[PDB]
Swiss-Prot record, chain A:
This is Splicing factor 3B subunit 5. The modification N6-acetyllysine is found at residue 17. GO terms for cellular component: nucleoplasm; nucleus; precatalytic spliceosome; SAGA complex; spliceosomal complex; U12-type spliceosomal complex; U2 snRNP; U2-type precatalytic spliceosome. The gene is SF3B5. Keywords: Acetylation, mRNA processing, mRNA splicing, Nucleus, Phosphoprotein, RNA-binding, Spliceosome. One of its GO terms (molecular function) is splicing factor binding. It holds the Pfam family SF3b10. It is found in: Nucleus. Coiled coil: none annotated. It comes from Homo sapiens.
Curated annotation (Swiss-Prot), chain B:
The chain holds residues 112 to 222 of 1217 of the full protein. Residues 82-111 are annotated as: Interaction with SF3B1 and SF3B5. The core of the protein consists of three beta-propeller domains. The gene is SF3B3. This is Splicing factor 3B subunit 3. Signal peptide: none annotated. Component of the 17S U2 SnRNP complex, a ribonucleoprotein complex that contains small nuclear RNA (snRNA) U2 and a number of specific proteins. Part of the SF3B subcomplex of the 17S U2 SnRNP complex. SF3B associates with the splicing subcomplex SF3A and a 12S RNA unit to form the U2 small nuclear ribonucleoproteins complex (U2 snRNP). Within the SF3B subcomplex, interacts directly with SF3B1 (via HEAT domain), SF3B5 and PHF5A. Identified in the spliceosome A complex; remains associated with the spliceosome throughout the splicing process. Component of the spliceosome B complex. The modification Phosphoserine is found at residue 45. Belongs to the RSE1 family. It is found in: Nucleus.
Swiss-Prot record, chain C:
Changing residue 51 to K: Abolishes interaction with SMN1; Abolishes methylation by PRMT9. Abolishes formation of omega-N monomethylarginine and formation of symmetrical dimethylarginine. Methylation at Arg-51 by PRMT9 is required for the interaction with SMN1. It is linked to Craniofacial microsomia 1: A form of craniofacial microsomia, a disorder characterized by a spectrum of craniofacial malformations ranging from isolated microtia with or without aural atresia to underdevelopment of the mandible, maxilla, orbit, facial soft tissue, and/or facial nerve. CFM1 is an autosomal dominant form characterized by mandibular hypoplasia, microtia, facial and preauricular skin tags, epibulbar dermoids, and lateral oral clefts. Affected individuals also present skeletal and cardiac abnormalities. The gene is SF3B2. It is found in: Nucleus; Nucleus speckle. It comes from Homo sapiens (Human). Signal peptide: none annotated. This is Splicing factor 3B subunit 2.
From Swiss-Prot, chain E:
It comes from the Eukaryota. Identified in the spliceosome C complex. Found in a pre-mRNA splicing complex with SFRS4, SFRS5, SNRP70, SNRPA1, SRRM1 and SRRM2. Found in a pre-mRNA exonic splicing enhancer (ESE) complex with SNRP70, SNRPA1, SRRM1 and TRA2B/SFRS10. Component of the minor spliceosome, which splices U12-type introns. Found in a mRNA splicing-dependent exon junction complex (EJC) with DEK, PRPF8, NCBP1, RBM8A, RNPS1, SRRM1 and ALYREF/THOC4. Interacts with DDX39B, CPSF1, RBM8A, RNPS1, and ALYREF/THOC4. Seems to be a compound of RNA export complexes that are released from speckles in a ATP-dependent manner. It is found in: Nucleus matrix; Nucleus speckle. This is Serine/arginine repetitive matrix protein 1. Residues 1-95 form the PWI domain. Coiled coil: none annotated. Part of pre- and post-splicing multiprotein mRNP complexes. As a component of the minor spliceosome, involved in the splicing of U12-type introns in pre-mRNAs. Involved in numerous pre-mRNA processing events. Promotes constitutive and exonic splicing enhancer (ESE)-dependent splicing activation by bridging together sequence-specific (SR family proteins, SFRS4, SFRS5 and TRA2B/SFRS10) and basal snRNP (SNRP70 and SNRPA1) factors of the spliceosome. Stimulates mRNA 3'-end cleavage independently of the formation of an exon junction complex. It comes from Homo sapiens (Human).
RNA sequence: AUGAUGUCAUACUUAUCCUGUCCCUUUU
RNA sequence: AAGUGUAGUAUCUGUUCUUAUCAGUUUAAUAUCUGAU
């Protein structure tokens, strides 16, 4: 397995460990996916927001919760 | 209400010995409750259970009769499908029940 | 490889905010969609200057 | 020391022009780098 | 690479691979060493080991070409043993 | 640990010299009422009379005793010597403690407790 | 020391102003940040020495001779 | 820190321990590096205080006397809810000072 | 002698293994032939050509000199007793400071004055190490900067090849070693991958820095080793540290152990777990298992609480070691188990259970130091056990402890002390049985005039006495320790005093009897009467004793007062210093006991002795006066404020450290509390005097000066204080120069800022850049100190900040960003959105900048604006920069976006605009468009 | 009865390029047998050299006696040889032959 | 011959302006000025 | 007519900083 | 006619590219750098 790719750390650089901290080489797909995931998490967080979003459809709160948790994986599309 | 911000899931074990707080992803803390000499519920330091690329669907407490307590969570892996331009690995990504045991002796959580 | 400035202006909805340095970008379509925002603030004129913005 | 810098040389020239040549302490009180002996030495050596 | 396929060291023996790995190390490393043999043995201790870390360790101990040889000798033998219903390769039955 | 005992003795002496220790508290109040000095770490090939003559430079020795083994040959490194006067014991602890002879240097201490055959340590 | 330092700085500024007046230099100008600037050299100077030292290098008087000849064609 | 930009904060998980600051650094803000307007108390890491590491100064690194607190400028800016602010590194300061 | 092995270090997996095998097969036949029957051994042509480097040629000039030197062996004996221009070359280049003769061999290449010759060019450019090591501080900083910038250019190979010998200099002083270590750290901070081949070469020089007496130097060595390990891979470091396990030199073994511990601390326990497990299972040699046990012990001691989860795994490494045949391996395993236990808080008792039974079994067959190691391990393991088994464990171990109480072994003594500290703290310890059995020997066998002399022995005895007093009782320990109060030994007296102080602080002296109280008083008196070394032991002890006695110390009050008076009449620095210290400490007890006549007499004596020239005595007198003013009231203090204020006024120019601190504290307390006896002209003179106190080399002095200026401002008025502060010409920009701005802010916080604002705005009109930057810094500090009070001054401070935002100078922009940060932090919720936007209009272009100070200020101001101006406007201003083409512009914008996203993670949903959906992507959040 | 700093090798600098090497060997032999004498054949090595005697005592005696000794027009500086610090160019190969020879000669 | 100024100021950079009457420009700022100038203005006007 | 270069001086900012220790190296 | 040290920044003085082209790295693009005529 001649790859020679040992990407762990070099000299204790900045190294953003936060999920969605953002970077310089962030492609448009990355920013869109991070934004969609953050918006889904926020919709799952705010109770009144969940009520206002699910009040549109006749589905129940659990229906919206399942539909939101299911859309977390690959919301935009395979890059 | 951040994605890495615990608060989306909170659980209490049946034995009343511990509590757990988990976010939508990339966060899991386990606080230990203990009775004091004056019956003061003292909150001990938390155990770190960071699981990267693991989205938690829900959390629940396992049944333990004064043994090593366990906490169950319906986890889903997202790191594999994050590098699948073909869109195939997005499918065949099944949620798994992860039961993490809080070893009272080791004082650390483990899968 | 690199799209033409004229092509990016023809494909853009608000090409009045197109720049010459945007043709060699990584996502010119995203840059055009962002620059035509409502309350979007632009970058300053020090992107190409050489006086350190205070000389 | 006595590096004999350029700005120090100009200051010494101005002092010899305005203050004078027979006033080494008056020039050393505005240099704060060398002594009046060193100041007069630089004046008689290079700043003459 | 051949070490890119997922394996499982729990579904195979260890004594059958001990002397083969020992001979491979004595041939590549030349001399007789106990740290390398014990390191290679403890490397396959987990139930779901990783071949990348094993290859990195072999490259650190070996030269890098002998490391590739050791990886390409240990990966397919272990894969064939894990594939065997009894849990061993074709060499364990020959002698 | 084994050779650090001489280091500890030398450090105690140096601290008493540097801390301004007086004559009444000069690491001798504890070893008083008995001049039985315990020497240890000596080599296994040391003779009794040779060690007696060596430690006799600081005065006359009253009663020396080397660690005589059951069948080994009296080669243990430990030894207990009650000298003539306690002043000689203090002088030996001050000068002869940590001296180098026959290769490996040995250590010296003041016990002043009893006549223990098995009390030292390798 | 400190007050002596302020007195020395004031005396140095006075000597520099006297030198600039004796030379009748137009370039030396006092800045709004307590500094000197040479418009002829088009440069800055932190201390009075750097402002008075704009006569050895960057002899822009030759570059001003061009404007002098452009304003008047006759020599 | 503003005085020591080459310092590395611990950023460890928070515990149930209350820390203290050295007498020489009494009152100095742990994060803001100010000298007025404290809001919240400083929480030490679990591994940041175990025996010999117990009772040390957060910023000064020396023996602590007074209990420290986070600066209000750091509390209002959502900065006090960060990891363990223990100065693990010690460099570019008090290195050659012992030689003098 | 042990460190001398470091002098025998030479520079530079299969070939190393064969070399180690050859070393062993060369170290065997030497004693082989020795039993069968040096550095000056024979030399070979290969050895000769290998010893020296290139640049030399062997040349015996004639055919007669070789056979002239061949019989030189016999020519040293028979014929030895018998009948029998202005050139020089130093090393100057342009300055090139003086190179010592020992450094002449190292910097010899620079001695050649040749110039203009590439590889030799780089080698000569690497001669800056000479200026770095030997030279002035500015040249040192310049060489450091050049090495930081020229890392990849000079190449890591030559840098290491030139730095390693300098580290091996036998004449390398402490400062030279510190500079070389700092240079190595700076080089390792930049070079990451290139440090792999030089791993062993750097470790061979860096390891001895860990094994050293200097605590700071050991910390620097540990940090450098950790950085070197984190740079390269754990596998490479493991391969480098592999052959050091079976090294003949035990010092090499200890160095490798410390290195493995540092590598585990950096790369983590489990990363080095299996390597250690393989090292422990090595049946090759006992030295291997010894090195492994030592590595485990060092890793535990360095990691502390990090061994909690892997502890069971560590037990798997340590379980097979307890059965070691060689006593050294068993002792190392016991020490490792004890380290893992004592370093671990109570947890994982089961993980150690496998080691529980044999160790106690070894206690049965314990003989010699092995018994001591087993006792230490049992003491470490006792608290980890539960009460049921702990009862039997302690009952069994106490007999062996009492039997070993008379051990002459100092190591056995320390082990017994640790076992007593661990076991006596157990709930299953019998108090009466303890006092009957362990107390008298602990007082006789443990407490001795020789044990206290040691360093570790002192702390061990203190901890043991504290634990025994807390367990069995305070009265017994007090009765045992009070007899030594008259000890001639100063160190023993200090130890007894510290023990009594710790006992009184922990248990409380209420259990002290009347006879015990009198004995303790006599002991404290004898101790204060005999104090040779200047130490806070006696002072802190007297203070704690007085605080514990309370009203019961009234009968001892007059004796203490008489002793203090006699010591004030005694030698000043020797006696009166401690006298004033005791007075300042017991002021609280003297005021509590209603020592009115005593307080007045003390005040009179203080007013009399205030004229002493000794700074050590004068400072203590000033501190005692401050304590008396703290206990005795202002109007009730017999030395009235009318005499104290003008008398303490000219004392500010004492120039001493403690004197200046005490005078500042006294003046500040008098001006903050009373603020009445000081006249207006008196306050003005005090301010004119305190203006000169800001030039000190301390920070606490500056803080006290600011506080005193604020008190004087609150007392007299704002106008005069602001006028006296406005005259700050700021000769130096450092040495508490901004301190004038801090004082202006303190006065504005104490006084009406309506008065301080326009005066500062007018003083900002001055031309001097120093004055302008000072006005900006003072405005920033004032806004930060005011906070909520700035709801009115926002519109007034807007235009000055907007004008100063024009980047005429970097310091001006830095002060502007700082003022903006303070204002945004202070205007939270007060309704200053318009001023925030007006300030951001000029603060936004400051994002493009390279100044570290300016960049930090701009980042802080952006954070403050996001806090107050809100993240919506922040993202609206930082939106276009995200997908910009450039590298620097994209970097700055990404830093701003990461700062805005670190917080406000919830509010980033709405600010995220609607980006159109591409072909293979649906980014538009259609759910947000759900119209109810 | 001497410091560890003293070693058999000694670096002699501050010499000419065409230094009379026979007289140099004679001067070095005043101490003991010259085990080796390397003359710097390089430009920077031109004017510097190293010597190595078969005994440390004689070398130290000559270092004490020949400290900055007079020359035709100069005085070469003689210092104790520093550590090697550069041996990767060399290697310990072919030592197994010497080991086998030692094991065969004595037989042990 | 300030070739330093010629390279730093952006000189010696060829540019062709078909909107500016098919003209030449020796710099990027020169190109921006030629795209928006009286010559290019008249060209666009005559071109409609 | 802005700039790049870097020995060698100069102003500035970080409320920068003077009792800091071997309390922990006790390996043979 | 007195300041100590730790990191970083700017303004001053001295020097250099009329090299016509091709390819690459790099740059937003230049520039610089690397090889050939």
């Amino acid at each position: 397995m001649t790859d020679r790719y040992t990407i762990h750390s070099q000299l204790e650089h900045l190294q953003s460990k936060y999920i969605g901290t953002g970077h310089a080489d962030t492609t448009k797909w990355e920013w869109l996916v991070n934004q969609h995931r953050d918006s889904y998490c926020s919709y799952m967080g705010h109770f009144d927001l969940l009520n206002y979003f699910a009040i549109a459809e006749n589905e129940s709160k659990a229906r919206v919760r399942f539909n939101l948790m299911e859309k977390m994986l690959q919301p935009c599309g395979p890059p | 209400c951040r994605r890495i911000v615990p608060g989306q899931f909170l659980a209490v074990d049946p034995k009343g010995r511990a509590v757990m707080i988990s976010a939508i992803e990339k966060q899991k803390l386990v606080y230990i409750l203990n009775r004091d000499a004056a019956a003061r519920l003292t909150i001990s330091s938390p155990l770190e259970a960071h699981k990267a690329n693991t989205l938690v669907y829900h959390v629940v407490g396992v049944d333990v009769g004064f043994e090593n307590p366990m906490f169950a969570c319906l986890e889903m892996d997202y790191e594999e499908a994050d590098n699948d331009p073909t869109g195939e690995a997005a499918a065949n990504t099944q949620q798994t029940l992860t039961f993490y045991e809080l070893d009272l002796g080791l004082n650390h959580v483990v899968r | 490889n690199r799209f033409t400035v004229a092509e990016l202006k023809q494909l853009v909805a608000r090409p009045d905010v197109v720049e010459m340095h945007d043709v060699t970008a990584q996502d010119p379509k995203l840059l055009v969609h962002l620059k035509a925002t409502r309350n979007s603030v632009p970058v300053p004129r020090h992107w190409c200057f050489k006086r350190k913005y205070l000389q | 020391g006595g590096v004999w810098r350029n700005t120090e040389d100009e200051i010494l020239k101005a002092a010899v022009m305005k203050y004078g040549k027979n006033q080494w302490s008056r020039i050393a009180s505005l240099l704060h780098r060398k002594s009046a002996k060193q100041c007069k030495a630089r004046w008689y050596e290079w700043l003459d | 690479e051949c070490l890119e396929k997922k394996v499982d060291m729990s579904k195979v023996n260890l004594e059958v691979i001990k002397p083969w790995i020992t001979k491979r190390v004595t041939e590549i490393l030349g001399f007789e060493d106990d740290v390398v043999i014990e390191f290679i043995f403890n490397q396959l201790e987990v139930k779901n080991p990783d071949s990348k870390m094993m290859q990195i360790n072999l490259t650190g101990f070996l030269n890098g070409k002998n490391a590739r040889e050791f990886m390409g000798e240990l990966w397919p033998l272990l894969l064939s043993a894990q594939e065997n219903i009894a849990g061993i390769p074709s060499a364990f039955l020959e002698l | 640990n084994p050779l650090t005992k001489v280091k500890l003795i030398n450090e105690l002496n140096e601290r008493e010299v540097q801390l301004g220790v007086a004559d009444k508290v000069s690491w001798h109040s504890e070893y008083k009422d008995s001049a039985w000095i315990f020497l240890g770490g000596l080599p296994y090939e040391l003779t009794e009379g040779d060690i007696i003559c060596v430690f006799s430079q600081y005065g006359e020795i009253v009663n020396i005793n080397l660690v005589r083994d059951k069948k080994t040959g009296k080669s243990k490194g430990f030894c207990f010597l009650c000298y003539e006067d306690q002043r000689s014991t203090i002088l030996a602890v001050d000068n002869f403690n940590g001296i180098k002879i026959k290769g490996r240097t040995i250590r010296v201490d003041h016990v002043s407790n009893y006549r223990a055959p098995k009390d030292s340590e390798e | 020391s400190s007050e002596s330092n302020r007195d020395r700085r004031e005396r140095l500024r006075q000597l520099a102003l006297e030198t600039i007046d004796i030379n009748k230099d137009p370039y030396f100008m006092k800045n709004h940040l307590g500094s000197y600037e040479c418009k002829l050299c088009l440069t800055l100077h932190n201390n009075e020495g750097s402002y008075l030292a704009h006569t050895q290098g960057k002899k822009h008087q030759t570059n001003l001779a061009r404007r002098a000849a452009k304003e008047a064609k006759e020599a | 820190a503003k005085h020591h930009p080459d310092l590395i904060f611990c950023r460890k998980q928070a515990g149930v321990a209350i820390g203290r600051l050295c007498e020489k650094c009494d009152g100095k803000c742990v994060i803001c590096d100010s000298y007025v307007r404290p809001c919240t108390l400083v929480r030490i890491c679990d591994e940041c205080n175990y025996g010999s590491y117990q009772g040390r100064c957060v910023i000064c690194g020396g023996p602590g006397v007074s209990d420290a607190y986070y600066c209000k400028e750091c509390t209002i800016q959502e900065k006090d809810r960060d990891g363990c602010p223990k100065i693990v590194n010690l460099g570019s300061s008090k290195t050659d000072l012992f030689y003098e | 002698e042990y460190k001398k092995h470091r002098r025998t270090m030479i520079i530079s997996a299969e070939t190393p293994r064969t070399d180690r095998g050859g070393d062993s097969i060369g170290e065997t036949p030497t004693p082989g032939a020795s039993k069968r029957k040096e550095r000056n051994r024979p030399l070979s042509d290969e050895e000769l050509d290998a010893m020296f480097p290139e640049g030399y040629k062997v040349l015996p000039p004639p055919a007669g000199y070789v056979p002239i030197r061949t019989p030189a062996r016999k020519l040293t004996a028979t014929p030895t007793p018998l009948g029998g221009m202005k050139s020089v070359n130093d090393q100057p280049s342009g300055n090139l400071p003086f190179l010592k003769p020992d450094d002449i061999q190292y910097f010899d290449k620079l001695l050649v004055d040749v110039d203009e010759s590439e590889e030799q060019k780089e080698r000569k450019i690497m001669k800056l190490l000479l200026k770095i090591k030997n030279g002035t501080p500015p040249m040192r900083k310049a060489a450091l900067r050049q090495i930081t910038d020229k890392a990849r250019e000079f190449g890591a190979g030559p840098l290491f090849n030139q730095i390693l010998p300098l580290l091996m200099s036998p004449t390398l002083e402490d400062q030279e070693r510190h500079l070389l270590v700092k240079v190595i750290d700076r080089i390792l901070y930049k070079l990451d991958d290139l440090v792999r081949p030089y791993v062993h070469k750097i470790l061979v020089v860096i390891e001895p820095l860990l094994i050293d007496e200097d605590y700071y130097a050991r910390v620097e060595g540990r940090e450098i080793i950790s950085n070197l390990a984190k740079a390269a891979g754990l596998a490479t470091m493991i391969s480098t540290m592999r052959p050091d396990i079976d090294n003949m030199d035990e010092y090499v073994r200890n160095t490798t152990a410390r290195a493995f511990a540092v590598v585990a601390s950096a790369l983590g326990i489990p990363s080095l777990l299996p390597f250690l497990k393989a090292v422990c299972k090595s049946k090759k040699s006992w030295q291997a298992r010894h090195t492994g046990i030592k590595i485990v012990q060092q890793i535990a001691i360095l990691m502390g609480c990090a061994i909690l989860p892997h502890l069971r795994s560590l037990v798997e490494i340590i379980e097979h070691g307890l059965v070691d045949e060689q006593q050294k391996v068993r002792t190392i395993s016991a020490l490792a188990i004890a380290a893992l236990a004592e370093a671990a808080t109570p947890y994982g008792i089961e993980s150690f259970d496998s080691v529980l039974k044999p160790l106690w079994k070894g206690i049965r067959q314990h003989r010699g130091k092995g018994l001591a190691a087993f006792l230490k391990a049992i003491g470490y393991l006792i608290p980890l056990m539960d009460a049921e088994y702990a009862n039997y464990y302690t009952r069994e171990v106490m007999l062996i402890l009492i039997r070993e109480f008379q051990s002459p072994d100092e190591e056995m003594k320390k082990i017994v002390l640790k076992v007593v500290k661990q076991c006596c703290g157990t709930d299953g310890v019998e108090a009466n049985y303890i006092k009957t059995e362990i107390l008298p020997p602990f007082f006789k066998h443990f407490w001795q005039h020789r044990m206290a002399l040691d360093r570790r022995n002192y702390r061990q005895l203190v901890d043991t006495t504290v634990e025994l007093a807390n367990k069995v009782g305070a009265a017994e320990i007090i009765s045992r320790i009070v007899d030594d109060l008259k000890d001639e030994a100063e160190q023993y007296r200090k130890m007894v005093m510290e023990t009594i102080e710790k006992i009184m602080g922990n248990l409380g002296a209420a259990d002290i009897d009347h006879k015990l109280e009198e004995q303790l008083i006599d002991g404290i008196l004898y101790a204060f009467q005999e104090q040779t070394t200047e130490d806070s032991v006696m002072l802190n002890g007297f203070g704690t004793v007085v605080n514990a006695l309370g009203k019961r110390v009234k009968p001892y009050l007059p004796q203490i007062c008489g002793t203090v008076l006699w010591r004030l009449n005694n030698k000043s620095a020797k006696v009166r210093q401690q006298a004033a210290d005791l007075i300042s400490r017991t002021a609280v007890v003297m005021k509590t006991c209603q020592e009115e006549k005593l307080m007045g007499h003390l005040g009179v004596v203080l007013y009399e002795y205030l004229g002493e020239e000794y700074p050590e005595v004068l400072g203590s007198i000033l501190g005692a006066l401050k304590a008396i003013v703290n206990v005795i009231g202002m109007h009730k203090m017999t030395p009235p404020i009318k005499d104290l204020l003008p008398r303490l006024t000219p004392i500010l120019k004492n120039r001493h450290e403690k004197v200046q601190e005490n005078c500042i504290d006294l003046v500040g307390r008098i001006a903050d509390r009373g603020a009445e006896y000081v006249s207006a002209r008196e306050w003005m003179r005090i301010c004119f005097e305190l203006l000169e106190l800001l030039k000190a080399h301390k920070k606490a002095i500056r803080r006290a000066t600011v506080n005193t200026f604020g008190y004087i401002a609150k007392a007299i008025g704002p106008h005069d204080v602001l006028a006296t502060l406005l005259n700050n010409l700021k000769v130096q920009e450092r040495q508490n120069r901004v301190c004038t701005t801090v004082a202006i802010a303190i006065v504005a916080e104490t006084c009406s800022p309506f008065t301080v604002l326009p005066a500062l705005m007018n003083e900002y009109r001055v031309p001097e850049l120093n004055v302008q930057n000072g006005v900006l810094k003072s405005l920033s500090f004032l806004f930060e100190y005011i906070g909520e009070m700035g709801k009115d001054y926002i519109y007034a401070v807007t235009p000055l900040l907007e004008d100063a935002l024009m980047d005429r100078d970097l310091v001006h922009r830095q002060t502007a960003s700082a003022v903006v940060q303070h204002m945004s932090l202070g205007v939270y919720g007060f309704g200053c959105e318009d001023s925030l936007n007006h300030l951001l209009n000029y603060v936004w272009p400051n994002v493009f900048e390279t100044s570290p100070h300016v960049i930090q200020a701009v980042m802080g101001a952006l954070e403050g604006l996001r806090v107050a101006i809100g993240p919506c406007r922040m993202l609206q201003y930082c939106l276009q920069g995200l997908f910009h083409p450039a590298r620097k512009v994209r970097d700055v914008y990404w830093k701003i976006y990461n700062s805005i996203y670190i917080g406000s993670q919830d509010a980033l949903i709405a600010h995220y605009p609607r980006i159109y959906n591409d072909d293979k992507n649906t980014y538009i959040r259609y759910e947000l468009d759900y119209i109810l | 009865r001497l410091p560890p700093e003293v070693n058999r090798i000694l670096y002699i600098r501050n010499l000419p390029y065409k230094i009379t090497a026979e007289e140099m060997y004679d001067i070095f032999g005043k101490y003991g047998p010259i085990r080796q004498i390397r003359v710097g054949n390089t430009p920077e090595t031109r004017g510097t050299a190293y010597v190595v005697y078969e005994d440390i005592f004689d070398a130290k005696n000559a270092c004490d006696h020949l400290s900055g000794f007079n020359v035709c027009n100069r005085y070469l500086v003689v210092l104790y040889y520093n550590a090697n610090r550069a041996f990767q160019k060399m290697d310990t190969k072919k030592k197994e032959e010497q080991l086998k020879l030692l094991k065969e000669k004595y037989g042990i | 011959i300030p070739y330093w100024l010629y390279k730093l100021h952006g000189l010696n950079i060829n540019y062709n302006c078909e909107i500016c009457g098919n003209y030449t420009y020796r710099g990027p700022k020169a190109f921006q000025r030629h795209f928006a100038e009286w010559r290019h203005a008249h060209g666009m006007r005559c071109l409609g």
